[PDB]
Design a protein around this ligand. Structure first.
Ligand SMILES: CCCCCCCCCCCCCCCCCC(=O)OC[C@H](COP(=O)([O-])OCC(O)COP(=O)([O-])OC[C@@H](COC(=O)CCCCCCCCCCCCCCCCC)OC(=O)CCCCCCCCCCCCCCCCC)OC(=O)CCCCCCCCCCCCCCCCC
Ligand SMILES: CCCCCCCCCCCCCCCCCC(=O)OC[C@H](COP(=O)([O-])OCC(O)COP(=O)([O-])OC[C@@H](COC(=O)CCCCCCCCCCCCCCCCC)OC(=O)CCCCCCCCCCCCCCCCC)OC(=O)CCCCCCCCCCCCCCCCC
Ligand SMILES: CCCCCCCCCCCCCCCCCC(=O)OC[C@H](COP(=O)([O-])OCC(O)COP(=O)([O-])OC[C@@H](COC(=O)CCCCCCCCCCCCCCCCC)OC(=O)CCCCCCCCCCCCCCCCC)OC(=O)CCCCCCCCCCCCCCCCC
Ligand SMILES: CCCCCCCCCCCCCCCCCC(=O)OC[C@H](COP(=O)(O)OCCN)OC(=O)CCCCCCCCCCCCCCCCC
Ligand SMILES: CCCCCCCCCCCCCCCCCC(=O)OC[C@H](COP(=O)(O)OCCN)OC(=O)CCCCCCCCCCCCCCCCC
Ligand SMILES: CCCCCCCCCCCCCCCCCC(=O)OC[C@H](COP(=O)(O)OCCN)OC(=O)CCCCCCCCCCCCCCCCC
Ligand SMILES: CCCCCCCCCCCCCCCCCC(=O)OC[C@H](COP(=O)(O)OCCN)OC(=O)CCCCCCCCCCCCCCCCC
Ligand SMILES: CCCCCCCCCCCCCCCCCC(=O)OC[C@H](COP(=O)(O)OCCN)OC(=O)CCCCCCCCCCCCCCCCC
Ligand SMILES: CCCCCCCCCCCCCCCCCC(=O)OC[C@H](COP(=O)(O)OCCN)OC(=O)CCCCCCCCCCCCCCCCC
Lengths: 48, 80, 347, 52, 63, 120, 98, 140, 169
């Protein structure tokens, strides 16, 4: 996707460290469908 | 201490029962033999993961397997 | 009030101030202010007349608003820092909100509008507590957050407090409102030097508490709540006129008295930091405070206003009032300027 | 008037809720435990002016 | 008094007050450098104590 | 100003390094002035309750003088300690930072030019 | 940052300007004060749940308890004002102007 | 409104009179709006019409003070050809004082505001010259 | 729409605060604060603060607003322009904020704010056999000794204070 944007670094860390940072919910389920989003982000909270 | 207690058990038995139940609740765990076992059961309940240790070479009291003899046992919890 | 209940409530006021002073967590700071307000409300309603209920209601509203703004500043600190240490703040918005909240807790202008009304509505001992003891906790929190305090904000609050506390007392004849506008002016003086040297802030706070405790103790000993009732002191207890003379000449910043020491050390530390105009305007504005102080001294000690005939009966009775520490508070509020380098113990 | 009574008496009244990297119940890690530990162990002892 | 006494006493007074004046100027300069750079014993505003940090193995390893 | 020094050992009124300093003598003019404040407090205490001022309660005036001298002795110890701490930190910062405190070349007045502004 | 934090802050400022602009009643002032407290509760809870910072989960309980005790004190002041004047109107509480 | 003062003080004296007059007019109008807001705050007017009337009167008064202030200052800097000279702001402050006296409809307030605001504007010019800090940064 | 459920509840929360903060009456002010407490409680419940949301319902709405309505029934008598005008003013301001942050996905009133849903900022981990919020509230007793001391002392003092000032003597 991010080819047309000038000056984009693909996979650029927003952190200055090289330590592994735990992935966020948007960092995993961001480019996916909203059903998978809801099942990962309010599934356990809404479950019965 | 005897006539006042019978008088207040005649007049206000609700408050006598209240202060008796509350006083036994205060002083009885200090005289109970089973208060230690509450502590022992609560610290032996494994909510987390028992993260293993790097065997540097000399840890004789740390086992290499769950079924090894050395380690904190719970025979007292099964038996009681 | 039951004296057991009075002792427990005053210990709770002191305990709230101590919890604000000694704790390292923002929630305990807020708990200490809540405890302090909740305990001091019956000290204000000790006499149970509509003026004490009005004063306690206004005090509740202002301190409650300040407490909620303080918790909002703490919450924005928890946003932008994820922690709770009572130290510098990590956001200028939280710094502005906490400076506003502590200015409301002090009664600094423009949030000064409760202090003369609430001080008028309550008795003299509760007014003494409000104008001396309740200044200790927010000045401690301002002492611990001074790396984050905006300079222009605290200096605007300081000069506005000095000017409004100067022009407020010039119209007043009630003694409690005079002490309240003097409180506004002196809190402006204390926060004006805070970012430059907070040891001089503590010096001004201690000398002001000594002088205010002296004036309220003299007002309780003479049972005078108006200027014109303070004027009848010469025909009853002539030493008290001398004491209010030397204490009001102290609070005006006249040398050789100890009330010259705070403002002289404040001008002394602010001109180290290349500020000449600001302490000069502060010092010229303090002449208004000294003007209504001189008005009180003229009405009380330097002249003799005409008395009534029933004073002859009170000539036959001495004072049975426990004037606690009044000679000590009178001496320490007048003759301490030779001991000006004692301020180093507050470093 | 930060009268540090807690460090003088050696008692712990409120140092435990103060940061996220403190001893949590059941050793629950916060989401920024490593980052706050790095920032605290950086900024410790050098004061606010050098820590900024 | 003798002119010797006034003269040498004046020199003692000038030595003491000149030393105090140089120490006041150095005091202002030291305070300026310590508020600016923040690397001395003064103006050390408190940071967080790093002894509060729990270094135990937590519930999840990514920390 | 010195908030980082008195934070590692908090609430010490007189630390252990304060005993390396000479204490104030009992003939200290500051301590004598605080004793005079105790005498004045005793006189005002007898005056406000309509007692004979110089006569009544010599035990009370003696306790006022004793109490002010007793408080003021420890206050002067803390005062001398804090100014000694101030000079110690000053001298350590001057000694440890030579590049910020250069030895100024003291020019004699044969080289120093000063513009003469006449008064006429 | 988070979009819901904007709404909870704006809610605190709405209840602030309600509390900072009286109409007639002291009860409406106390309602605006406890709406401010409600927004503080929600904002603190959303931060502490978001951070997974465990020991501050007891903090909103302490906020709620202390400020509801504050609210009981305010209602007792309102009751004494209403026993004095008959209403809880703020214009009856102006004896201290002189 | 800090940038109002910045866009006042960026322009040199005696060069661009219309923009300096507009900037000083806007600064005075902002001050008049602040005084109007506090005056309708602490004192309730008789109606909303009286409130907007008092607001417009105070705002136009302070805006006219700033307008004649900046106009007199820049035209005096042009006709005297001296940029770094506080006599320009002295005459401008006296013109603003006469403006305040004309708005308050009295002569003695006009002369008093002339003298005091002229001395004040000269002090502001000298603080602009030697760099006098009223809100000085703590340095020691 | 369902992914933005906490945002929708927050907009209803702001609308409720505009509803009672315009102050039509203390009775309807209490009603608006009850509805606001319910929807803000829903905001809290949708992040996993189940105990804190039920503390809202049980304590806030269950005790304190009951006492506010109880006192309002003893203060005012049962049987405008500024209220409705300020209500529609706040509603216009809030929907302009919503329209701006939905058309631009970045807004700055005082701070910067994202325009996406707040589902993105959650954690992707599990807690095990406990609620972390429940265990942190359970730690009020073992860890929070001083906190319980000062809170219980403030409540006992609050009892004493209310009995002192309502006595009238
Ligand atoms: C450390 C700081 C200590 C500060 C002072 C602490 C005490 C005062 C605060 C508490 C209080 O209000 O106490 C009442 C207060 C008296 O206040 P008051 O009502 O105005 O008394 C006036 C008449 O004396 C009332 O006369 P009376 O007929 O009722 O009885 C006479 C009474 C009888 O005496 C006794 O009863 C004492 C013997 C019993 C002692 C306790 C035993 C238990 O004599 C006195 O009290 C004489 C005055 C004592 C000294 C007062 C001032 C003390 C120093 C204050 C600070 C000065 C700082 C100067 C610094 C300068 C540079 C900054 O003190 C006492 O009653 C006891 C004084 C003990 C002094 C100890 C000094 C060393 C402390 C270490
Ligand atoms: C010393 C200064 C402080 C004394 C305070 C008490 C004075 C007093 O009561 O005098 C009357 C008392 C005799 O009175 P009495 O017959 O028993 O009864 C009083 C009459 O009934 C009096 O008749 P009355 O009361 O029925 O009516 C007349 C009326 C007359 O009054 C009026 O008509 C009203 C006022 C008239 C206009 C104002 C005039 C000025 C008055 C205020 C002073 C302001 C200037 C102070 C400095 C400027 C800054 C404001 O009132 C009085 O006369 C009140 C009595 C007290 C008068 C003196 C007041 C002195 C306190 C103020 C100055 C000192 C504190 C501030 C210092 C600030 C820095 C320098 O005389 C003395 O006590 C004289 C003492 C002289 C011997 C001193 C021996 C020193 C020994 C030192 C070695 C031993 C200690 C070693 C310590 C170190 C150990 C290490
Ligand atoms: C402030 C500037 C002056 C404008 C306000 C004047 C007084 C209030 C007023 O308008 O009352 C009328 C009116 C009602 O009063 P009123 O009934 O006329 O009372 C007067 C009597 O009826 C008596 O009738 P009158 O009007 O004929 O007499 C009044 C008299 C007029 O006096 C005369 O007619 C005779 C004397 C000639 C004029 C005064 C010349 C003084 C020259 C300075 C001293 C000598 C310097 C020598 C230098 C030599 C080398 C250059 O003027 C004054 O008393 C005003 C004195 C200056 C006011 C500020 C003083 C602050 C002193 C701070 C320390 C320095 O008050 C109001 O409506 C209140 C609000 C007024 C509008 C707001 C005030 C203007 C604010 C502009 C910005 C100011 C920024 C700060 C600048 C100053 C501080 C750095
Ligand atoms: C130590 C453990 C912790 C104890 C604290 C916890 C208590 C839990 C229960 C909570 C009770 C809350 C309310 C308590 C109020 C007590 C005071 C009281 O009620 O006094 C008044 C009462 C007479 O009532 P009256 O004034 O006539 O009013 C009309 C009612 N008919 O007077 C009376 O009725 C007299 C009451 C006092 C005498 C009661 C003696 C009971 C002894 C029981 C056996 C020993 C138990 C050990 C602990 C003893 C503690 C005292
Ligand atoms: C009369 C004084 C009585 C003092 C009794 C002892 C009190 C004490 O131990 O105070 C300790 C305190 C120094 O503690 P420290 O942590 O250095 O304070 C920095 C915070 N501003 O020391 C002080 O605060 C000493 C100065 C107290 C002055 C009070 C009267 C003026
Ligand atoms: C420029 C236009 C300013 C318009 C707002 C100020 C005018 C004013 O005073 O409005 C009146 C209003 C009170 O309404 P009023 O009719 O006086 O109520 C009495 C009961 N019949 O007064 C108020 O409601 C007081 C607060 C009005 C708003 C002040 C802040 C905004 C205006 C000043 C900055 C511009
Ligand atoms: C009524 C009570 C009794 C009297 C009390 C005392 C009142 C007067 C006190 C001050 C004395 C008068 C003012 C000082 C005159 C001495 C010379 C001077 O400073 O002249 C000002 C200046 C003249 O030009 P010049 O000297 O070249 O200045 C260039 C500076 N680089 O001229 C100018 O630059 C023009 C004017 C600019 C504004 C000056 C405002 C401050 C000074 C007056 C106050
Ligand atoms: C100038 C002038 O004529 O001022 C008159 C004015 C009062 O005008 P009026 O005539 O009352 O209408 O009067 C005023 O406005 C008050 C005084 C105006 C300025 C007078 C300047 C000289 C003052 C005396 C200086 C002494 C040295
Ligand atoms: C009696 C009253 C005496 C008043 C004397 C005032 C003297 C001037 C003090 C303020 C001033 O103008 O300071 C100069 C300063 C420019 O200096 P500089 O540090 O370069 O500022 C650029 C900021 N980056 O400029 C500034 O700080 C900005 C301009 C400030 C003007 C303040 C007054 C404006 C009019 C009233 C509002």
């Amino acid at each position: 996707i991010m080819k047309d944007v000038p000056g984009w670094k693909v996979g650029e860390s927003v952190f200055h460290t090289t330590r592994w940072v735990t992935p966020m919910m948007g960092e995993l389920y961001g480019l996916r469908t909203g059903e998978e989003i809801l099942s990962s982000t309010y599934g356990f909270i809404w479950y019965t | 201490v005897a006539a006042f207690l019978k008088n207040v058990w005649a007049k206000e038995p609700v408050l006598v029962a209240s202060f008796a139940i509350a006083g036994l609740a205060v002083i009885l765990p200090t005289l109970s033999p089973y208060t230690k076992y509450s502590l022992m059961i609560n610290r032996a309940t494994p909510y987390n993961y028992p993260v293993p240790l790097r065997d540097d070479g000399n840890m004789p009291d740390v086992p290499s397997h769950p079924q090894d003899p050395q380690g904190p046992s719970l025979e007292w919890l099964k038996r009681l | 009030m039951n004296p057991i209940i009075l002792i427990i409530i005053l210990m709770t006021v002191m305990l709230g101030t101590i919890i604000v002073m000694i704790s390292t967590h923002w929630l305990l700071i807020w708990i200490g202010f809540e405890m302090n307000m909740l305990a001091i409300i019956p000290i204000m309603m000790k006499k149970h007349n509509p003026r004490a209920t009005e004063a306690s209601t206004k005090y509740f509203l202002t301190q409650s608003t300040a407490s909620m703004l303080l918790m909002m500043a703490i919450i924005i600190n928890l946003m932008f820092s994820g922690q709770w240490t009572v130290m510098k703040l990590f956001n200028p918005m939280a710094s502005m909100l906490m400076t506003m909240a502590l200015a409301m807790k002090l009664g600094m202008a423009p949030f000064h509008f409760w202090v003369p009304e609430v001080t008028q509505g309550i008795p003299l001992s509760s007014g003494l507590i409000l104008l001396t003891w309740q200044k200790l906790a927010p000045m401690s929190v301002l002492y611990q957050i001074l790396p984050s305090i905006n300079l222009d904000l605290i200096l605007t609050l300081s000069i506005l407090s000095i000017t409004i506390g100067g022009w407020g007392g010039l119209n007043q004849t009630q003694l409690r409102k005079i002490m309240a506008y003097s409180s506004i002016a002196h809190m402006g003086w204390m926060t004006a030097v805070l970012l430059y040297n907070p040891t001089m802030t503590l010096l001004n706070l201690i000398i002001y508490i000594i002088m205010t405790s002296t004036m309220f103790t003299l007002f309780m000993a003479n049972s005078t709540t108006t200027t014109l009732s303070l004027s009848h002191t010469w025909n009853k207890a002539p030493i008290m006129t001398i004491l209010v003379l030397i204490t009001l000449l102290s609070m005006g910043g006249l040398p050789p008295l100890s009330g010259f020491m705070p403002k002289w050390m404040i001008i002394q530390e602010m001109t180290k930091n290349d500020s000449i105009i600001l302490p000069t305007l502060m010092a010229i504005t303090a002449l208004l405070n000294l003007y209504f102080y001189m008005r009180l001294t003229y009405s009380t000690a330097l002249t003799m206003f005409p008395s009534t005939n029933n004073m002859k009966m009170k000539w036959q009775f001495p004072t049975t009032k426990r004037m606690t520490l009044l000679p000590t508070m009178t001496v320490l509020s007048t003759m301490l300027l030779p001991l000006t380098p004692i301020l180093s113990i507050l470093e | 008037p930060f009268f540090d009574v807690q460090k003088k008496l050696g008692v712990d009244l409120d140092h435990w809720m103060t940061i996220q990297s403190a001893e949590q119940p059941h050793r629950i890690p916060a989401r920024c435990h490593a980052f706050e530990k790095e920032w605290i162990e950086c900024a410790h002892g050098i004061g606010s002016i050098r820590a900024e | 008094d003798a002119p010797e006494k006034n003269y040498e006493r004046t020199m003692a007074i000038l030595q003491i007050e000149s030393e105090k004046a140089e120490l006041r100027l150095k005091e202002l300069e030291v305070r300026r450098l310590m508020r600016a750079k923040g690397d001395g014993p003064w103006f050390q505003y408190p940071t967080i104590d790093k002894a509060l940090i729990d270094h135990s193995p937590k519930a999840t390893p990514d920390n | 100003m010195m908030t980082g020094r008195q934070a590692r050992a908090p609430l010490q009124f007189l630390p252990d390094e304060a005993r390396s300093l000479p204490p104030p003598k009992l003939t200290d003019p500051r301590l004598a002035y605080i004793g005079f404040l105790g005498y004045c407090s005793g006189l005002i205490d007898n005056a406000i309750r309509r007692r004979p001022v110089l006569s009544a309660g010599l035990h009370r005036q003696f306790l006022y003088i004793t109490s002010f001298v007793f408080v003021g002795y420890y206050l002067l110890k803390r005062q001398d300690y804090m100014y000694a701490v101030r000079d110690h930190d000053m001298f350590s910062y001057i000694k440890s930072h030579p590049e910020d405190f250069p030895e100024k070349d003291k020019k004699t007045y044969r080289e120093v030019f000063e513009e003469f502004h006449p008064v006429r | 940052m988070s979009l819901v934090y904007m709404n909870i802050m704006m809610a605190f400022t709405v209840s602030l300007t309600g509390l900072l602009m009286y109409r007639s009643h002291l009860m409406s002032s106390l309602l605006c004060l406890e709406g401010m407290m409600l927004s503080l509760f929600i904002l603190a809870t959303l931060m502490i749940l978001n951070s997974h910072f465990t020991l501050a989960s007891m903090m909103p309980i302490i906020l709620l308890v202390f400020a509801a005790c504050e609210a009981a004190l305010g209602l007792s002041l309102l009751v004494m004002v209403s026993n004095t004047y008959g209403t809880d109107y703020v214009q009856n509480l102006n004896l201290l102007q002189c | 409104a800090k940038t109002l003062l910045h866009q006042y003080w960026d322009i040199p004296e005696g060069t661009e009179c219309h923009r300096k007059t507009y900037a000083a007019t806007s600064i005075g109008g902002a001050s008049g709006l602040v005084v109007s807001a506090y005056s309708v705050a602490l004192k309730t007017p008789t109606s909303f019409l009286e409130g907007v009337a008092r607001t417009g009167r105070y705002t136009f008064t302070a805006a006219a003070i700033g307008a004649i202030f900046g106009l007199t200052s820049c035209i005096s800097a042009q006709v005297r050809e001296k940029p770094d000279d506080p006599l320009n702001y002295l005459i401008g402050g006296c013109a603003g004082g006469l403006t305040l006296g004309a708005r308050t409809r009295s002569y003695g307030i006009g002369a008093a505001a002339c003298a005091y605001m002229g001395l004040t504007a000269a002090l502001v010019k000298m603080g602009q010259l030697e760099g006098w800090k009223v809100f000085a940064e703590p340095k020691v | 729409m369902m992914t933005y459920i906490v945002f929708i509840l927050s907009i209803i929360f702001v609308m409720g605060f505009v509803g009672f903060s315009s102050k039509p009456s203390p009775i309807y002010g209490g009603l608006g604060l009850i509805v606001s407490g319910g929807v803000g409680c829903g905001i809290v419940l949708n992040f996993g603060g189940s105990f804190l949301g039920l503390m809202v319902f049980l304590i806030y709405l269950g005790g304190m607003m009951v006492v506010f309505g109880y006192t309002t029934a003893m203060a005012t008598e049962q049987y405008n322009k500024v209220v409705l005008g300020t209500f529609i003013t706040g509603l216009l301001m809030e929907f302009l904020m919503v329209y701006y942050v939905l058309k631009d996905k970045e807004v700055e009133i005082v701070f910067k704010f994202n325009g996406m849903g707040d589902w993105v900022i959650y954690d992707t981990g599990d807690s095990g056999f406990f609620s972390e919020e429940a265990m942190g509230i359970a730690a009020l007793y073992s860890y929070g000794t001083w906190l319980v001391i000062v809170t219980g002392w403030s409540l006992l003092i609050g009892v004493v204070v209310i009995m002192e000032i309502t006595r009238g003597n």
